[PDB]
Amino acid sequence: ACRPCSDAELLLAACTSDFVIHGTIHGVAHDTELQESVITVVVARVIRQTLPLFKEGSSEGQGRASIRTLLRCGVRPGPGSFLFMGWSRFGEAWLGCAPRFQEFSRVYSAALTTHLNPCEMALD
């Protein structure tokens, strides 16, 4: 449940997911009882969502929001911008895939160019 998504999986997930957001990891909190992690992301942009999970920006400037995953996946804060995608459970975001933004951009460009993209989205 922690393995990276293949490029084919990324493409399908980005169209079928409840949310797709671009951002960086500010911090990670761990729940050692539930064995889950809560990832706090700085949201650069909401690409698409099926539910009002996320928004971009705030009165403080940047907006932050959190995404759950399994503790064993070992997610860490770090530099790097990612495209987080996943599903909602009880109104909480859960992580499905998290490619680097430039990696998903490559995949989507290739899919668009081959007309293999299952949907359209604006990554910019």
Q: How far is CA 16 from CA 19, 20, 59, 65, 105, in A?
A: 9, 10, 31, 21, 17
Question: Cα(102)–Cα(68) distance, rounded to whole angstroms?
Answer: 23
- Domains in the chain, please, with CATH? 7-114 (2.40.50.120)
**Best CA proximity match to 13, nearest among 115, 95, 112:** 95
Which residues share a beta bridge with 122? none
User: How many residues in total does the chain contain?
Assistant: 124
Report the structure determination method: X-ray
Residue with tokens 């700085």: 42
Question: Cα(104)–Cα(70) distance, rounded to whole angstroms?
Answer: 22
Contacts of 11 (CB under 8 A, 6+ apart): 107, 108, 111, 116, 117, 118
